[PDB]
Amino acid sequence: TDWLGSIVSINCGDSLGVYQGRVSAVDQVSQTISLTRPFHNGVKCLVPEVTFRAGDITELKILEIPGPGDNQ
Numbered sequence: 529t530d531w532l533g534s535i536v537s538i539n540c541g542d543s544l545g546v547y548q549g550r551v552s553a554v555d556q557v558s559q560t561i562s563l564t565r566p567f568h569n570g571v572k573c574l575v576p577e578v579t580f581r582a583g584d585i586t587e588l589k590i591l592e593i594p595g596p597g598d599n600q
Contacts, residue, residue, distance in 0.1 A: 529554045531561055533599025535592040538563065538585050545569065547578060548591065559583060 537548040538561065549563030562579040565572060 529556060530594075531588075533594035534590055536561075536563070537587075537589040537591055538580055539587040540580060540584050541586050547573070547580070549578075551594075552577065553579070555579075561585075 531551045532554050534551045535549065536551055537546055539546045545568065547563055547566045547568050549566030551561060552564040553562035554560070555562075559582045560579050561582060562577055564577055566578050567573065
């Protein structure tokens with residue numbers, strides 16, 4: 529759950545491409561990671577939260593590390 533509060537770029541492979549955003553949630557049981565207000569193709573997604581399975585991610589880039597405070 530260490531990714532929480534970071535800003536990341538998540539590549540989901542050829543079919544969905546790349547999403548960038550703040551990590552708002554991490555679910556260790558379902559093995560997912562949620563981005564709030566993510567961008568895709570240089571534009572803000574219309575949906576405010578998108579949740580990805582870790583097993584679908586081909587590359588995770590850490591754009592900003594979490595800050596030292598409450599990231600929940």
